[PDB]
UniProtKB/Swiss-Prot annotation, chain C:
BP terms from Gene Ontology: mRNA splicing, via spliceosome; RNA splicing; spermatogenesis; U2-type prespliceosome assembly
Keyword check for Repeat: yes
Keywords annotated in UniProt: Acetylation, Isopeptide bond, Leucine-rich repeat, mRNA processing, mRNA splicing, Nucleus, Phosphoprotein, Repeat, Ribonucleoprotein, RNA-binding, Spliceosome, Ubl conjugation
Coiled-coil stretches noted in the UniProt entry, renumbered to this chain: none
GO molecular function, a single term: RNA binding
Protein name, per record: U2 small nuclear ribonucleoprotein A'
From Swiss-Prot, chain E:
Any one of the GO CC terms: small nuclear ribonucleoprotein complex
Keywords from the named record: Acetylation, Cytoplasm, Isopeptide bond, mRNA processing, mRNA splicing, Nucleus, Phosphoprotein, Ribonucleoprotein, Spliceosome, Ubl conjugation
Location of the protein in the cell: Cytoplasm, Cytosol; Nucleus
Miscellaneous comment as given in the Swiss-Prot or TrEMBL entry: In the autoimmune disease systemic lupus erythematosus, antinuclear antibodies are developed with Sm specificity.
Main location: cytoplasm
Region of the whole protein represented: 20 to 116 of 118
Role summary: Plays a role in pre-mRNA splicing as a core component of the spliceosomal U1, U2, U4 and U5 small nuclear ribonucleoproteins (snRNPs), the building blocks of the spliceosome. Component of both the pre-catalytic spliceosome B complex and activated spliceosome C complexes. As a component of the minor spliceosome, involved in the splicing of U12-type introns in pre-mRNAs.
A GO biological process held by the record: 7-methylguanosine cap hypermethylation
Record GO terms (molecular function): RNA binding
Domain called Sm: residue spans: 10-84
Protein name: Small nuclear ribonucleoprotein Sm D2
Top-rank lineage group of the source organism: Eukaryota
Family label: Belongs to the snRNP core protein family.
Gene for this chain: SNRPD2
Swiss-Prot record, chain F:
Compartments it resides in: Cytoplasm, Cytosol; Nucleus
Classification via SMART domains: Sm (SM00651)
Molecular-function annotations in GO: RNA binding
Main location: cytoplasm
Assembly: Core component of the spliceosomal U1, U2, U4 and U5 small nuclear ribonucleoproteins (snRNPs), the building blocks of the spliceosome. Most spliceosomal snRNPs contain a common set of Sm proteins, SNRPB, SNRPD1, SNRPD2, SNRPD3, SNRPE, SNRPF and SNRPG that assemble in a heptameric protein ring on the Sm site of the small nuclear RNA to form the core snRNP. Component of the U1 snRNP. The U1 snRNP is composed of the U1 snRNA and the 7 core Sm proteins SNRPB, SNRPD1, SNRPD2, SNRPD3, SNRPE, SNRPF and SNRPG, and at least three U1 snRNP-specific proteins SNRNP70/U1-70K, SNRPA/U1-A and SNRPC/U1-C.
GO cellular component, one term: U5 snRNP
Entry-linked CDD domains: Sm_G
GO biological process assignments: 7-methylguanosine cap hypermethylation; mRNA splicing, via spliceosome; RNA splicing; spliceosomal complex assembly; spliceosomal snRNP assembly; U2-type prespliceosome assembly
Stretches assigned to the Sm domain: 1-68
Organism field: Homo sapiens (Human)
Membership in a protein family: Belongs to the snRNP Sm proteins family.
Name of the protein: Small nuclear ribonucleoprotein G
Swiss-Prot record, chain J:
Any single GO BP term: spliceosomal complex assembly
Organism: Homo sapiens (Human)
Modification comment: Methylated on arginine residues by PRMT5 and PRMT7; probable asymmetric dimethylation which is required for assembly and biogenesis of snRNPs.
Taxonomic superkingdom: Eukaryota
Job of this protein: Plays a role in pre-mRNA splicing as a core component of the spliceosomal U1, U2, U4 and U5 small nuclear ribonucleoproteins (snRNPs), the building blocks of the spliceosome. Component of both the pre-catalytic spliceosome B complex and activated spliceosome C complexes. As a component of the minor spliceosome, involved in the splicing of U12-type introns in pre-mRNAs. May act as a charged protein scaffold to promote snRNP assembly or strengthen snRNP-snRNP interactions through non-specific electrostatic contacts with RNA.
Entry keywords, A to Z: Cytoplasm, Isopeptide bond, Methylation, mRNA processing, mRNA splicing, Nucleus, Repeat, Ribonucleoprotein, Spliceosome, Ubl conjugation
Miscellaneous information on this protein: In the autoimmune disease systemic lupus erythematosus, antinuclear antibodies are developed with Sm specificity.
Protein name, as recorded: Small nuclear ribonucleoprotein Sm D1
Primary gene name: SNRPD1
Ranges for domain Sm: 2-74
MF GO annotations: RNA binding; U1 snRNP binding
Keyword Ubl conjugation among record annotations: yes
Gene Ontology cellular-component terms listed: catalytic step 2 spliceosome; commitment complex; cytosol; methylosome; nucleoplasm; nucleus; pICln-Sm protein complex; precatalytic spliceosome
Amino acid sequence: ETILEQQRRYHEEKERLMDVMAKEMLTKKSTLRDQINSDHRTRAMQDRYMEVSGNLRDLYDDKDGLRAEFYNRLKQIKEFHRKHPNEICVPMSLKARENPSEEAQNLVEFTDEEGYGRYLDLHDCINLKASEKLDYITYLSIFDQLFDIPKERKNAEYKRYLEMLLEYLQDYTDRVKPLQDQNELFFEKKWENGTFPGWPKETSSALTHAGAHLDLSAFSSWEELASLGLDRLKSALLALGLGGTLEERAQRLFSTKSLESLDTSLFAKNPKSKGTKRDTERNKDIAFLEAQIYEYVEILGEQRHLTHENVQRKQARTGEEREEEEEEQISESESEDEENIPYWLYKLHGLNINYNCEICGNYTYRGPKAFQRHFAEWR
Amino acid sequence: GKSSKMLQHIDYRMRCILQDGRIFIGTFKAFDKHMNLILCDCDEFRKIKPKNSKQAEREEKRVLGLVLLRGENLVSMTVEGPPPKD
Amino acid sequence: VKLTAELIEQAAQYTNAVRDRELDLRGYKIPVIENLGATLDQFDAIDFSDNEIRKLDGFPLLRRLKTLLVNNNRICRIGEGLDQALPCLTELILTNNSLVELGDLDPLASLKSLTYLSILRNPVTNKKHYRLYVIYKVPQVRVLDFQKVKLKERQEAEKMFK
Amino acid sequence: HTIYINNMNDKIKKEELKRSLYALFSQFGHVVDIVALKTMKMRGQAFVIFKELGSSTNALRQLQGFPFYGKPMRIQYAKTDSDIISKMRGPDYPPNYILFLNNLPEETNEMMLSMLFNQFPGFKEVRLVPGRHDIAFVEFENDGQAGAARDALQGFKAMKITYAK
Amino acid sequence: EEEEFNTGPLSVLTQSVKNNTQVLINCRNNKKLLGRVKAFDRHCNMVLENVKEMWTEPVNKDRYISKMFLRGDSVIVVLRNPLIA
Amino acid sequence: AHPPELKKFMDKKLSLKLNGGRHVQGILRGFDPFMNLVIDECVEMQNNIGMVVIRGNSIIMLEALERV
Amino acid sequence: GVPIKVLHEAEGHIVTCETNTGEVYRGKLIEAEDNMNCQMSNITVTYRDGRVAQLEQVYIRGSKIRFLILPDMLKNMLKS
Amino acid sequence: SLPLNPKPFLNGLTGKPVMVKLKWGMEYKGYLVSVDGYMNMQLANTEEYIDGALSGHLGEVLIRCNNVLYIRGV
Amino acid sequence: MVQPINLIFRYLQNRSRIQVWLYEQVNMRIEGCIIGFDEYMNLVLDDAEEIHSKTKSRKQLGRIMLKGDNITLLQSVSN
Amino acid sequence: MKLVRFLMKLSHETVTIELKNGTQVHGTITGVDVSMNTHLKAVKMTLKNREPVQLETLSIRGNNIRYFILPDSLPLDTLLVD
RNA sequence: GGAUUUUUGGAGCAGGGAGCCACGCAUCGACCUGGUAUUGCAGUACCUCCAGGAACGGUGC
């Protein structure tokens, strides 16, 4: 096998994919814009387009129609980028043959399926135009990733966690809204004004589950951003700063041992002590998870607010209102991502009498004259 | 009187303990006379029920999915988390 | 006629004659092995006979796959990470394919459970010392080309290639 | 549809024998089932059942005397129809051992058809020789062998061979 | 039914409740409960008073339980005696 | 007071997994609503025990050795 | 019972069954009785040691079933 | 005998010395005072034989039905 | 079709010596001649024996009523 | 007579229950039903050979109960009246 | 409304010792080397026999 051909086909496929996700970014600029905006608040350096472009949903001169579909295409582009990364990887890793090419000369076959099957394998849009999804990701379904209450990233469902929370506090004095008020705590509040004692079991377990949820939700709602990049960023921030990152002019330096320290000196000589060794060796995973909950909730401030709002709304609804709203959320959830008298007369005449034809759909006929007319019919 | 003691927890995420000592966590959607249970998005745990075990929370976890458990083999249930909205 | 979940979903599924769950992928003119994820790891073995596959590669992690019948295809190369996606691969039938060099059979050394191997009707078969080479490089094989790997052959393959 | 194999090394355990048999014979078509017992009576034998009949004929001709676990296997068409075939499916001379018909020309000849018919121990009558070289009269000692030859070239791309029904 | 509680094998329990006498209950848990029968039923569920629970772990052990309810399936044997005396 | 749906398995050879890690094989000759079975030409997994009664209580699983 | 109706709904689908002894049977559910007696076909069985086998036809008594896994195709009886 | 059933057999054995084996391998010898519909059993002057050896002399005893393996007259 | 209860009724009439497999106990089985039985499969056995499969030892019992709880399986023996 | 009826009266009592599997349960009864299925709140449950876990709520299948240890204060003679 | 498929139980109990490595007893099964018998058209608890090997597997105490 001549490697030249393989590497060629690779560069060609990469080109094909770039072209596909570029066509996408073209039809609906939001796809990129959306993504980029979020990226902006994670990696501050990122340069973002002119606001006007974003609003008018245009890339150069033409303003495109505003578009579940955005998210869909974002996950599709996600798998595309996965393919691309794979190919890039493998890639990083004459007369003799022309003679054997003479093999099996006599085949009556038309061969127009190398670039067409690929170009096609990665393009928009069924028979003609029913499903935006490419053949590449034809079995891609968002509803298996997002619940109905999340509305493809619009809201995050925290009712469940309100339940678990009630189970954690061993009472009922806590309302959904007071619970959200609790969540708001999450750079210093969640640490110095904790809902519960941060060494409580139930509490730490809960916090773990919740943290995990928020993170998965985050990356779920923003497929286009490099997950590994974000993860590593946060981890390095955790290791390099979260080193007495919390400082008070009065109490000094706080340690996630839950104690302060006069000066940095005693703080450092405390990070080798048996106490801190014990704690950092037992409560490491929890501390880290807490931190993640913190930063991921920060990155999702807009979604948190959006949901809290939703809660208050639904709460202030009536019965009919709440019902119709639910109807709406439901429809949004299960909708295609791309839209396209003679009484004795009938006895006398013999009609309205129950009868059945077996060969036709086990069909029912109400009259004998009619069924006798079935014998000559189209169906 | 009320019959509610099971119906209350319906739709909630529930931690169920089996007679061999397994832990089934799923969404409690239905029960009956025998306490045969219907558990949506159900996983099985063996080693632990985590209360934030600093080493790890999850070992021998298995994704099962939609589970019908026979009541014969059920021991007990506690509330694990609130209902998923979906 | 790309391999597809749609293709896989309408494919004959049955319990074979040796009591294993088998998927029938035969005679579709498949050129590249892909999208196996959709089988959901529910088959003991897959029958890929009479197709146009060039390389035994592209498999997802499939823990239950134990038998691969790959008769009358165009296999000329074997992928390198096969044990990482097929840990319990026990039987591999490659009759009537295109493996030409002894070195192309090297990737089979990494399949720790591989016990039944058939490479008949491949050019590689006529290479000097083909049998001893396979025995020394893939010692986990117990039956090669429907003949028992015997001790004397193992020793003989230990001399040559030691 | 079913081939009868004998002269097999009876030291192989039953489940291993059946699995190698399945593997070996999969190259010609889907094998529906394999019947092999180790009783005194049945040891060293096996019945291999294929979905397609052309597959059985191809298997028979191509693997005649194939070394399997040390011995050369002997293959033949089974005497009766397999129970599985009869269930999946649902004249007095049939199966007959004399196949006369034509539609097999193209420089074809008597030593050609005589060697193809020869393949079979049933090789008894072979009539293919006039300017024709396209009318084949084959009298095969028995229908297992006539059926073997006929099943071997049962679609000589389409020749017409008609048993003396 | 009362007749069957009164004269049948359960009369052992019926007699213990009436006379406020002690009985030893050999139990499935490999433990033995020694006390007075305040109430009982078909299944041999019981409400017991002044229960001395005894078992072994070899080491013998015991513990006092003033008031308790026993689900009757755990019953192996119920013994009446000159125990109360 | 339902019957087990076993008419399909009548007069077929079967493989019976019983509690105690016990296994027997034989031909189904009949049954009742408790799933008590009559098994003929029964064999303890091998020694021949003839026609026997298996109490449905102790029946874990059965597997047909035939096609139904 | 409500769960029983949902079980009958899974007839004709591929299901997984664990017994009281922990053997795991996966295949097509042909018939499910009221008492949980289960007729299945084209089974894969995974024993407690990990080994697999293949069976054409099986029938398991309801009492000696620990649990069943049903498709997620059913999840969509929300009234109760 | 012409059909001798469980119930009458046990009733004939009331007033008699019996020994009951339990599933758990304990054995209890005494005079059978009575049995009931569920086959719960009442012994007097009971003795306990464990490993077939006299262990304890117990007096009047109720045995729950589910424990019983078999009963023997003796 | 033979019904299981009837088989027993046959065992009874025949006075065939019977060997019973017990529930969750493999090392011991019980033997005897069924004289009568009831709706719960409780059996009255005559000249009954405990059979120790491990020790090859037999314990002589005489008149036995075995609760049906223990019955796994019922077989006939020539002895 | 039917002693489950007696247990059904013990809502809002705190008890210790020993299970068949050896587990020990201490909590406040919210409800006992006819199958002796028992429901509790503010529960400290100690599986045999663990340190306790606290649960806001726990629901026990009735059959899995060995026995209830009742409050010493409990006025049994009152509760046994129907 | 305690008698075989659920809620009045068939449960209960038994493992460390020796210097990371190795392990008592009983039953059953393939199983592995040699050699040797059979050439038989079937729908199957298993399937020749003879000698040697088991740092093999399962179950119970």
